[PDB]
Amino acid sequence: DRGVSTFSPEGRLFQVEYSLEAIKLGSTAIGIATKEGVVLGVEKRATSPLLESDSIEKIVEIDRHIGCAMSGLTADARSMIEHARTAAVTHNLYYDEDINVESLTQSVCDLALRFGEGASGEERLMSRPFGVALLIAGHDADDGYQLFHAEPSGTFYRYNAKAIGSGSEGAQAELLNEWHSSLTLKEAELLVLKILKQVMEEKLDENNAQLSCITKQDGFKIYDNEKTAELIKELKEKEAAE
Amino acid sequence: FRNNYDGDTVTFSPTGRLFQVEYALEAIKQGSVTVGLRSNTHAVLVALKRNADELSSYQKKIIKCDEHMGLSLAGLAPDARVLSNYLRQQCNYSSLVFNRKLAVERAGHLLCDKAQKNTQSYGGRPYGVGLLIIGYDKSGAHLLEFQPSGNVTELYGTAIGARSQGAKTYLERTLDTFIKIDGNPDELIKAGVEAISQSLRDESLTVDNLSIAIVGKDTPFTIYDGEAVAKYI
Amino acid sequence: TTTLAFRFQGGIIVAVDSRATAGNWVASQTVKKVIEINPFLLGTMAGGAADCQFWETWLGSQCRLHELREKERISVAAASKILSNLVYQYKGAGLSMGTMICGYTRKEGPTIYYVDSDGTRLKGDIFCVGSGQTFAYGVLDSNYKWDLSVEDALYLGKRSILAAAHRDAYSGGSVNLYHVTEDGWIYHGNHDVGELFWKVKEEEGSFNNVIG
Amino acid sequence: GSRRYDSRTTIFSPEGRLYQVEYALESISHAGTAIGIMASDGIVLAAERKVTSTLLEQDTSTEKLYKLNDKIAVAVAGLTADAEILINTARIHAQNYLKTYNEDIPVEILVRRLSDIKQGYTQHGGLRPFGVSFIYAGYDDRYGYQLYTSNPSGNYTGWKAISVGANTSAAQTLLQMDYKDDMKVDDAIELALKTLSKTTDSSALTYDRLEFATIRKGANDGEVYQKIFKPQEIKDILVKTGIT
Amino acid sequence: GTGYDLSNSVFSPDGRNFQVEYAVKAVENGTTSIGIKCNDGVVFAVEKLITSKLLVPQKNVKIQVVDRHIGCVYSGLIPDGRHLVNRGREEAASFKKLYKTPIPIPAFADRLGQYVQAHTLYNSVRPFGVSTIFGGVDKNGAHLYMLEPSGSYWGYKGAATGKGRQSAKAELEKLVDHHPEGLSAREAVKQAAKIIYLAHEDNKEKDFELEISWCSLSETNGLHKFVKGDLLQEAIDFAQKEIN
Amino acid sequence: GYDRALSIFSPDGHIFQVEYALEAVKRGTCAVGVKGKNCVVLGCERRSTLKLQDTRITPSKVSKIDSHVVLSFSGLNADSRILIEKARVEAQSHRLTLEDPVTVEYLTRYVAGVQQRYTQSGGVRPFGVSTLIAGFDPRDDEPKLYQTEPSGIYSSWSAQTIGRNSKTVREFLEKNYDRKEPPATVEECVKLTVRSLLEVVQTGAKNIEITVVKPDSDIVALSSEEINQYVTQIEQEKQEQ
Amino acid sequence: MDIILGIRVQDSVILASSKAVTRGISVLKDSDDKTRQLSPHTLMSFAGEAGDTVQFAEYIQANIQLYSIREDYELSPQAVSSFVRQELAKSIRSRRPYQVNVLIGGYDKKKNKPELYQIDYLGTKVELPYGAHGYSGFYTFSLLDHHYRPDMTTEEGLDLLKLCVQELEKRMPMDFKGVIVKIVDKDGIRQVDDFQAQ
Amino acid sequence: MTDRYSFSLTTFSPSGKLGQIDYALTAVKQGVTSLGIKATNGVVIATEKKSSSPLAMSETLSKVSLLTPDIGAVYSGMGPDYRVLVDKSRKVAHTSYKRIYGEYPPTKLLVSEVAKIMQEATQSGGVRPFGVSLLIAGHDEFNGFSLYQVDPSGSYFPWKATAIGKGSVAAKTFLEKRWNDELELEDAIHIALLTLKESVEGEFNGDTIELAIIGDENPDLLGYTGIPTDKGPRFRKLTSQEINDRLEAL
Ligand SMILES: *C[C@](*)(O)[C@H](Cc1ccc(O)cc1)NC(=O)[C@H](CC(C)C)NC(=O)[C@H](CC(C)C)NC(=O)OCc1ccccc1
């Protein structure tokens, strides 16, 4: 066949690229970073009315100051989260302090290219790249609120806002306009909620969508349905208002 | 042709080419531009940080390896991390064991040798990143260009990345000029920014988009970004 | 070291001394022999300083991971077994630590666990661990009632560690108190024996030996 | 590299099938038929020797019926060599169980272990599966008489009567036709011989082309006895049942 | 059929190893370099294409030393050349450590020989993309060697490889004939500088930089040293003169 | 030594080996599970390509991981054993260290990870198996029902099915299961289960086995008759119209 | 050592185990249950080195339970003891052996007979009418060698134990804080909560 | 480096065939003929010494090898594969039997060992099956005389007499005619020589033939005396001379 870590003539790694195609088929995930915190929202996307929508966990807590959202082959994200959580706790044990959001992200991305069948560089024993992308959002005393996009390519970017998954290119353009350096947390919440509504196939409600944020004061919290449902209502109203 | 000899690095084409290595090189080109130039007292790295969206950052392209050495990356970020890190250890080792700062020329040999290994054994893939190493050691200022092929060269100045050909011609001209910017850092830097702009086209180097690093006689390799470079735009 | 912890009607009381020695040299009289794993988990330290400090701090990190992983507070039983099982891995290597793990999960209620480097893990209502455990037991055993006021229980505790601080050459410094209700642990201050002794002597009439 | 010559023996077909297993089974289908019939007072194992000659030493021969334990025996269909590899490791497992619990290994426990080994070559390692199918005939104080069957896939099941190898579909129909729950060893012995007789790809069903074995609990005793019929014994029982 | 050229250790119908031959192509495509054996030592010289004015002159060195008496120069994939020297260096240290005496040139040759030949035995490795000229002075004379990607190597009076191996070889052959008594270290150094200049015609498009080194029992005490300053200029001129 | 990457991405972003693993699940016999208000039921169909088996000793489809948790599946039998085993071992290990039996979600999450792991490790193909894990968390009475698949994904269902014709029977359950009022009884819960199986089993008294799990390690399987009685009464619901 | 007694009567097996847990000069606990239930009809008591004791017990408990679920069947007492002996026998020749002695008492539902096994940390197994580990054996074997009859009822068995426990309280130097008794018969395992004065 | 051939080189084809085993058999079919006949008091194995040049010394090339003092083997197919097989066989006879029980292994077991080795070269990663078929003849106290044939597949069966290689079919037929369960060793040796003559194109004498027997004990070939229980090896290779003598009575 052809090496799992081969280069296309255009200078790209097939497996990583094909990996990205998979992520495109994933459920939408959006993150907005403001000076009042970072907001993370995701499209549950239950595949059947019998599936208990709240057993869908696409937003998880890395540490009290770091949380993340995933898109694509979500099963692949478990070991990533695990690695992340451990790295956070471990850092704290060794240094008596919180792991910087960028450092944590850098650590997760270090697993990215560790795949192959005998790649001369260490012991990269993983048959394929990860089929999921992550939005790592947190806060630290050095660079405040941060939003990161971690991909199977090993590279991670920092965004003020970012959308990944099925409705990404669409939602991304939206964020472009809507985002400004003085958004409030509440504005960002509604905003994410609105953009999810446009890209989602299903009619957004507090059951096929989930919000969450991370603020220096109370850290990472996942909004329980009731809390979100009202923001949904509040959004429909502000929209109908013009 | 090619299609049958580019399945992996361990294969030679009928003409003697290693396509996988070549495709790796192709990732460098697709990478943002960066430039390096040195006088006899300093060495400077001016790198153009590239952004995904206007909501995304301009991914850092300058890594410090030791107080007296650093480099700029053009290509796969992860690979630059791997390589920079390796260099950081070699520098560290040299200090701890011999209480000696690592010669820039030697750091180059180490990088070449490490890359070469991924081009002769099955399974591995070449590194998809280009590196520009600058440093001040026991023999003055130094500038190195590192190619994934394993080829490392020492120059007075140079550039790699997209449209890098602009800056490279400009410096091949400005040679006699900047090579004498001894004792003056701000000039060598300006001389660099004037080389990097020779490869622009899309936009103009903004503040949160320009990145410069310097090292020399009495300057521990340091990196400037944003406000720090404002006075160079 | 002297440390104690006992269960009673109002929850759990935990008292410890704060002296650290190396032979006959008194290296410190200001040591924190109690680690707060979390809002409802306390670990006491008796034995080798490094051993306790290091491994109990490590225990803390393990408890945190359990909570991130299971989205639920780790039980006092499981928290203690983790330390226990770890310490057992090193059995025979020389680790030295007499530990007490106290907490209050809704599932177990007030709970105290004794865990030492021999690999012994015991559940109980009363425990005194340390070079001065016998001195504490003497005072504590003879005044304990399940029905003590959170005020009295607290005192008895403080008084027992005081007892030990007096008779045990390797115990002393000050007393650190804690109370565990299902609303978590509640620090009840540090009481320097330097003054606590005389005060209790006068106000209590005990320590009737010493000339004051 | 070598990836060029790798047959990838452990992959799924677009239809969710395991090529190698399917082909291994295809191989098994050309193997001499083996039959196992379980009666109330015992189990019967009969097998047809694929290819033979005048010069072949049938006395010292064995290519289908192997004794695993004293209470368990198997009938083979496929690569004899592959079968022997599994037979031996099977024999070891039995002994470990004994040395550990001071009790003979329950029939299913042994069967599962062997089947698990097979399933292994099905999911990892990049090696070909074993081209073997077994009919296990055993007895234990928990389920008494038991009959099992395992194949390349690593799947195994229990039967009252079963066949493996060549013409199983034909043999199964014939068995499903004359089997009766209350049967008796002697009855099964005959049912077995008849079935083979009607599915053989040969002219006649002679003794020299057979292997026969029964596992009874000899009334005058109280314990289990495995009997592997000798050429002469087969020749007799062959005439008696009326096949001369 | 075909495809005998896609895997490294494969034999083609005519008994060749195409991958090794393709490696040679990479070699022929590289800079030219040579070696001249004289009456008490050896001289090495190589062409250094000046891709640009940015190349710090005299810096990017190519000739390498092994131990203290061996000099190595190669044409082809430079990184591969370094790799081969790193090995040789260890190969040498190992020898000295056990036998005390520094490794004899012939002995050293086979070390590199065997190692290179090794990379033509498996399809999991690529052959070396360089031809190497190396040598030095030992317990009994001076020795010049050239090693092919095939691992093949022989002793030479003069040797050359790379882009202008023919021009060189042509020149070398002249020398061999016009000096049956033996050239001198001083002589060879100039002669070499010339041959590089001549052989540079097959690449006359780009400007180059000369590099020479030598090991002479009398001129360097048997140690490998680079030709610098005056002696270098003197030889550069001796060539510049006869190039016209 | 064998580490060939058998599960890799294709141009469209699919891991064909995992995909084909699901095809093996579609082929396996059907399995279903519906949770009541105080119980969970697991029904499975029985093939008939060959009938003359010994039901006593032939391995049953519903397996006990611990005294309070069961696991049923659709797909390759051989493959399931490997998972059942691992689950059972992890179950004991968890008791040994945490001093408390596993929760259904935990045991499910573990099984799922094992599966996920086989999708991105060298030299191994994915498990051609999907499972339904159900039971009651320790000292809890709220029923739990989860499902896993080759990919390593897992979630909880009010009711679900896997295997051949699961398509059909899922519809039945989608328009027959009211989350508002779940089968408030073990009986009406078991009925809803058979009804859904009949949609596909096509009259199979001996081709249908049900298992009922109640709180506090109360697990029991129904015998032909008990089930046959449910079939009988149900066919009358039809004829009485 | 601690007190570990076992006595097999007519239709059951009785295990008596001391309740004290002493470390150094202090009696840390006086209600210790030096036993683990391996299966519904098999009980194992143990004594020995501080950590090894429970670790071993629980390790064996886990394995038997795993066997039970895998095979949906309860191993016979004989089989379980054979498993435990092999374990100890492997341990004795390992880097750091388990220093634990055990008594395995179970009711074999297939034979409908109680069984008592004594196995020491070396992997020395033996079946007996009655057994004990430690110094206790030095007083109880002759005691039982006198007052023991195979046909004794469970009740006669408990009186026989009381007689032993009294002899041990009289002559043994240590205060073992009484014992905990448990009965293993055709109906499982149950604990006599009233022995502190029966 | 490193054998990265960790997968099987022999696999099942859609038809159910195991190609490499088949091809290995084809290789055996081309090999020079060899046979074996079992008498009531001995066994005889023989083959043709197809010298590959008149300059080569046929002696320095035995196709008939002694595995144990009571077991000998001969083959048909690829000589080199045979050679290494004999080595492994001779060794396994010790490691797995003599060193454990203090006595040489009985014919069936040693054969069983060889068969195992061959079976593995049919499934192990990165190897091709053995291109040979063996005929092993031996004698052990509890099984008497026996003759076995081992194939590349690893399968083996006991024979009264049989032949492998080039003209096996023809030779097998000729044996069925002349064999009977009352043959004496000399009768079989004779019959052997006859059957072999049909398969030989050129010279047929004691120098172009290799024949050995498994018969009575040769205390003369023991090498020492003083131990009653040790009577000598039952395996003996016939000398070029001893053959010719029987050829004149052909
Ligand atoms: C009395 C308690 O055991 C006390 C527990 C404790 C916990 C945490 C911290 O930071 C301090 C103390 N520990 C000690 O008193 C113990 C002495 C006896 C073993 C009880 N002391 C040591 O652990 C000692 C503490 C240092 C001063 C930090 N560490 C040690 O290295 O001492 C061994 C020693 C060396 C030489 C002479 C005699 C003893």
Of F13, F120, F121, the CB nearest to A24: F13
Token pair belonging to D167: 């013409």
Q: CA of H7: which chain F residue's CA is closest?
A: F2
Q: What span, in angstroms and rounded, lies between the C-alpha atoms of A198 and A178?
A: 14
C42 lines ligand 1 (CB under 6 A): no
Distance spanning both ends of chain E, measured CA to CA: 53
Q: Where are the alpha helices (DSSP H) in H94-157?
A: 99-101, 107-120
Q: Which residues of C96-121 are buried (b: 16+ CB within 10 A; e: fewer)?
A: ebbbbbbbbbeeeebbbbbbbbbbbb
Using CA atoms of B163, B169, B171, B172 in order, give the dihedral in degrees to the nearest 10: 150
CA angle G167/G173/G174 to nearest 5° reads 95
Q: What is the dihedral of CA C66, C67, C72, C78, to 10 degrees?
A: 30
Chain C residues whose CB is inside 8 A of the A79 CB are: none
What 3-state class would DSSP assign to A107? Answer: helix
**In terms of CATH architecture, what is D1-244?**
4-Layer Sandwich (3.60)
Superfamily of domain G1-198: Aminohydrolase, N-terminal nucleophile (Ntn) domain (3.60.20.10)
End-to-end CA separation in angstroms for chain A? 58
G79 CB near a chain D CB, below 8 Å? yes
Q: What is the DSSP-derived secondary structure letter of residue F124?
A: B
DSSP string covering D188-232, please?
Answer: HHHHHHHHHHHH-SSSS--GGGEEEEEEE--TTTSS-EEEE--HH
Residues of D with CB under 8 A from a CB of G: 99-103, 106, 109, 141-142
Between the CA of C48 and the centroid of ligand 1 the distance, in Å, is 5
Cβ partners under 8 Å of residue B11, min gap 6: B5, B18, B19, B20, E6, E8, E19, E126
Give SS3 for G28.
strand
Longest dimension (CA), chain C: 58
- Helix/strand/coil percent split, chain D, to 5: 40, 25, 35
Domain with C140 in it = 1-212
Over the range A11-31, which residues count as b (16 or more CB within 10 Å of their CB) and which as e?
bbbbbbbbbbbbbbebbbbbb
- Distance separating alpha carbons of residues F210 and F237, to the nearest angstrom: 20
Angle between helices H79-93 and H107-120 (to 10 degrees): 130
Closest ligand 1 atom, residue C27 Cα: 27
Is the distance from CB of A64 to CB of A138 less than 8 angstroms? Answer: no
| Contact (CB<8Å) F96/G66 | no
Distance CA B45, CA B34 (A): 7
Q: Ligand 1 center to residue C170 CA distance, Å?
A: 9
Q: How close does chain H come to D187, measured CA to CA in Å? A: 32
Could you tell me the two tokens for D224? Answer: 């289990």
Domain A1-242 CATH (choose: 2.60.40.10, 3.30.1490.110, 3.40.50.300, 3.60.20.10): 3.60.20.10
What whole-number distance in Å separates Cα of residue B224 and Cα of residue F132? 57
Q: What angle do CA E93, E94, E95 make, to 5 degrees?
A: 90
d(CA C191, CA C157): 12
CB G47 within 8 A of CB G101: yes
Comparing CB atoms, the residue among D101, D109, D142 nearest residue G83 is: D101
Q: Do the two chains H and F touch, given a threshold of 8 Å on CB pairs and at least 3 pairs?
A: yes
Q: What is the DSSP string of C83-133?
A: HHHHHHHTTTS---EEEEEEEEETTTEEEEEEEETTS-EEE-SEEEESTTH
Read off the tokens for E145. 């060697």
Q: Tokens 């006593």 identify what position? A: F56
Q: Tell me how long chain A is.
A: 242
| Best H6, H9, H123 residue to mutate vs chain F (most F CBs within 10 Å) | H6
Q: Is C49 annotated to bind ligand?
A: yes
**Cβ pair F106:C78 closer than 8 A:** no
> Contact, B196 vs B48, CB < 8 A?
yes
Q: Answer whether C170 contacts ligand 1 (Cβ < 6 A).
A: yes
Exposed (0-12), middle (13-18) or buried (19+): which is B227, by Cβ within 10 Å?
exposed
Chain F nearest C-alpha distance from G189 (Å): 18
Give the count of beta carbons closer than 10 Å to the beta carbon of residue E172.
23
Residue H162, CA distances (Å) to C172, D56, D64, F157 in order: 97, 8, 22, 68
b/e code C36-57 from CB counts within 10 Å (16+ = b): ebbebbbbbbbbbbebbbebbe
Answer for the pair H169, H212: CB distance below 8 angstroms, yes or no: no
In terms of C-beta density within 10 A (0-12 exposed, 13-18 middle, 19 or more buried), how is residue D180 classed?
Answer: exposed
Annotated active-site positions of C, please? 1
Q: Do H172 and D53 touch (CB under 8 A)?
A: yes
The answer to whether the CB of C13 is under 6 A from ligand 1 is no
Tokens matching residue D180: 């009766």
Whole-angstrom Cα distance, residue A77 to residue F2? Answer: 26
What is the homologous superfamily of the domain F1-241 according to CATH? Aminohydrolase, N-terminal nucleophile (Ntn) domain (3.60.20.10)
Ligand 1 in reach of C94 Cβ (< 6 A):
no
Q: State which H helix or E strand residue C166 sits in.
A: helix C150-167
**Do residues G36 and G60 touch, judged by C-beta distance below 8 A?**
yes
Alpha-carbon distance of A133 to A25, in angstroms, equals 11
Q: Does residue C27 have its Cβ closer than 6 Å to ligand 1?
A: yes
- The answer, yes or no, to whether any atom of ligand 1 lies below 6 A from the CB of C169, is no
Fold of B1-233: Glutamine Phosphoribosylpyrophosphate, subunit 1, domain 1 (3.60.20)
Q: Which of F97, F106, F139 sits opposite C81 (nearest CB)?
A: F97
| Cα distance between residue A93 and residue D47, in whole Å | 68
CB distance F66–G72 less than 8 Å? no
CA angle F178, F182, F187 (to 5 degrees): 130
- Distance from A152 to chain D by nearest Cα, in Å? 24
Q: Is the dihedral of CA G83, G89, G91, G95 positive or negative?
A: negative
Quote the Cα angle for G82-G85-G91, to 5°: 145
Looking at the complex, does the CB of residue F224 fall below 8 Å from at least one CB of chain D?
Answer: no
Q: Which of B206, B203, B221 is nearest to B38 (CA)?
A: B221
Question: Are the C-beta atoms of residues A28 and A171 closer than 8 Å to each other?
Answer: yes
**Distance between CA C97 and CA C49 in Å, rounded?**
8
| Backbone dihedral angles phi then psi of residue D225, each to the nearest 5 degrees | -125, 130
DSSP string covering H32-95, please? PPEEEEE-SS-EEEEEE---S-TTS-GGG--SSEEEETTEEEEEEE-HHHHHHHHHHHHHHHII
Would you call A97 helix, strand, or coil by DSSP? coil
User: H-type helices in chain F, by residue range?
Assistant: 16-27, 77-98, 104-117, 166-174, 186-201, 224-239
Burial readout H121-157 (b: 16 or more C-beta within 10 A, e: otherwise)? bbbebebbbbbbbbbbbbbbeeeebbbbbbbbbbbbb
- According to DSSP, the residues that pair with F211 across neighbouring strands are F42, F221
B47: nearest Cα among B169, B193, B203: B193
A8 DSSP assignment: P
* Residue D150: how many other CB atoms lie within 10 Å: 27
Distances H75 to E230, H129, H133, H146 between C-alpha atoms, Å: 76, 15, 6, 16
Could you state, in order of their start, the residue ranges of all structural domains in chain A?
1-242
Structural domains of chain H ordered from first start: 1-250 (3.60.20.10)
**Chain E contact for D1 (CB, 8 A cutoff):** yes
Q: Which method, experimentally, gave rise to this model?
A: X-ray
From the CA of E175, how many Å to the nearest CA of chain B?
32
Instruction: Please identify among residues 100-129 of chain D the ones whose CB lies closer than 8 Å to any CB of chain F.
Output: 108, 112, 115-116, 118-119, 122-127
The token duo for A180 is 């400004």
Give the relative orientation of helices F77-98 and F104-117 as an angle to the nearest 10 degrees: 130
Q: Give bridge partners of residue C43 from the DSSP assignment.
A: C35, C101
* Nearest C-alpha neighbor of C17 from the set C198, C156, C178, C193: C193
- Interface check for E125 against chain H (CB to CB < 8 A): the answer is yes
Among candidate residues H42, H36, H75, the one with its CA nearest the CA of residue D56: H36
* CA dist B56 → B61, H2, H10 (Å): 15, 45, 54
The answer to whether the CB of C46 is under 6 A from ligand 1 is yes
Closest CA to E36 of E139, E150, E135: E135
Protein residue with least CA distance to atom 36, ligand 1: C22
C-alpha G95 – ligand 1 centre gap (Å): 30
Rounded CA separation F212/F226 (Å): 12
In degrees rounded to 5, what are phi and psi of residue A107? Answer: -65, -45
Contacts of C36 (CB under 8 A, 6+ apart): C42, C185
Give the C-alpha separation, B159 to B169, whole Å.
9
Domains of chain E: 1-244 (3.60.20.10)
The number of C-beta contacts closer than 8 angstroms across A and D is 4
